[PDB]
Amino acid sequence: DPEKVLEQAVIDMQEDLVQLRQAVARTIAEEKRTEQRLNQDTQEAKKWEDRAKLALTNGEENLAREALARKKSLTDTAAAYQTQLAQQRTMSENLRRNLAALEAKISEAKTKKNMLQARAKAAKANAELQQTLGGLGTSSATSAFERMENKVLDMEATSQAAGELAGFGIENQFAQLEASSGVEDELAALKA
Template structure:
């Protein structure tokens, strides 16, 4: 299209140049024909009929030449107009083609980018990613279960300790049991009952031993 446009512009320039040249010749011929007409009129006024006839002959020759040139000028004017119109139409088409070319380039670049993205996405191994996330979830669940078990064990130890404290009792509990005669016999020599001693004396001795033990602690 660019080459055709150059050729059409050259053709239009050639036609316009020819039109201008012929137009100049036409004006010269028409001016000469008009001059011979004035001379013929002058000769008639002066009574020179022969001279007037000669002037009219020359005027006729130049007028015929001018008329022919005028026809060529009109033809070239139509031709140059057509060429100029076609040139403008081709220029518009060329501009449209350039604009479409830029649009297609942009679309091609966008399509290429989209294709590259799709190829990149298709190359990703999503199954491996899913497996990795599943492993992470399993590890987190195991950690949570371990923490919950530890919490339950700590709570169980606390409960056991409380029950042991209740079962063991205090010094006051032992004193009350001692007074009731329900305290188990001690294996120590100091706690043994001497033969022939009353029970009350034995209790006093046991109580005294517990007091000494308490003071020593």
């Protein structure tokens, strides 16, 4: 059934955009976390170089080169974290583009299905006009007027029976009425 499916697909899209928002936020944490490290880390290199300068000021070359080893170790770690940062920023723009595209895709998928549904529903409504007009009144109502007309024609058949009866051999009874009508006309001839 259509409406169920089309709305369900749209429902799914609402989950998806939230999931990718989480992943974006997660990536923001990765950048924040690496910034926090790299910023401090690069200062730590300085701090141990400063500790080396204390040995320069006077005293222990052993401490001084030991402190270089700290500085080096930190420097190396910062290069690793700089590399990690490139992976974060690349993955971030990957999510960003994926999302922006997905959002447009979702948006139009929903909107097209809705306006399609609307025009499909409107189209079948127009077709249902033509169908209901095709539900013409040219019907068995004619047969009902006909049924009772078949009895009208039975009264006409009763009128054939009335005419079929109507001759009786008693028509001669009119004759003296006509003769006496002549008599009253002779009374008119008497009047003038």
